[PDB]
Symmetry: C3
């Protein structure tokens, strides 16, 4: 019921140097989860292996995942395969509109196995993902 895992991939630690930092993002997400009667567990890593371990744990616990894989979105089959194990919903979030930039950003290995996908609505995208999981 309560626990939602928010997982951020490579370079998302560099947020705010917008002016919103990753710590600020964690704080916004936590607050919104509280207002929605959820607990958000937010994690970020530049390491593919660390991201896979976190997905493994969400699979074993049957908890939902909101995932912004950063660059790995367009490149990693390993991450996609880890996510394919999830039984609870997977929501893909991108801060920027990945369809308005380079062609390589318009393909995601994650989109076809995600429940849904939100892009280009900024940091609010994460909050809106939270809200979707709350009404489901």
């Amino acid at each position: 019921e309560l626990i939602v895992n928010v997982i951020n991939g490579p370079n998302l630690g560099r947020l705010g140097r917008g002016g919103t930092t990753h710590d600020e993002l964690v704080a916004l997400i936590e607050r919104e989860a509280a207002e929605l009667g959820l607990k958000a567990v937010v994690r970020q890593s530049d390491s593919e292996a660390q991201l896979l371990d976190w997905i493994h744990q969400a699979a074993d616990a049957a908890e939902p995942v909101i995932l912004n894989a950063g660059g790995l979105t367009h490149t990693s089959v390993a991450l996609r395969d880890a996510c394919a194990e999830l039984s609870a919903p997977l929501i893909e979030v991108h801060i920027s509109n990945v369809h308005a930039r380079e062609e390589f950003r318009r393909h995601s290995y994650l989109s076809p196995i995600a429940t849904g996908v939100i892009v280009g609505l900024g940091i609010q995208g994460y909050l809106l993902a939270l809200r979707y999981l709350a009404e489901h």
Copy 2:
């Protein structure tokens, strides 16, 4: 003569949750190697860097490798380049038939430099790889 390195990539630790676990696989491989008069050293990691170090060691020791790179099979040039250094045979194994699934799984950076490749014969594929190395 005796030593064969079996290297498993990302997500192969999730075997059995088939019902064959990775530990079970290690056990099957070891037994078969013993019956063939070989020693199997089996290793698994979700970390590309760890996989590359293991390939580096096989190159320096001039020992054979049976490799199931998981997702990295379709994506990693770095791993392919590490494997290109091997002087002893490289056998590529996939549990599933990667040619019966998504198009992206039908390209391997490893196949063109491998001695040969076995797919879709399940866990027995590893054992059959062992047997090939024993008669060569």
Copy 3:
């Protein structure tokens, strides 16, 4: 003014087993930097995450980077995105002529955001990169 970061990616630790080793390369680069009135800080890792941290530090310090990403050159969007943060020049170096080999080596995620690119001039490529940064 003085500091230039030279960053080597996966498999570059295997140099010399040419006969030039990575340690030898570090030594050549340092000497040339000294003769040019610079300091070269040379680093190598098989770990994408480690490479990204080093790029993050160059971005925060506003220092230049000479980067040979190895295999990650052709595959990593995450590394490209990290490098896009650099305000000082980025020079891409490849020891081999990547345009004379397999087709996959003829695409780089880094070239379009690099100041310039040197390939196929061997280890001297790094020294020539140093010299460019010295006259700019």
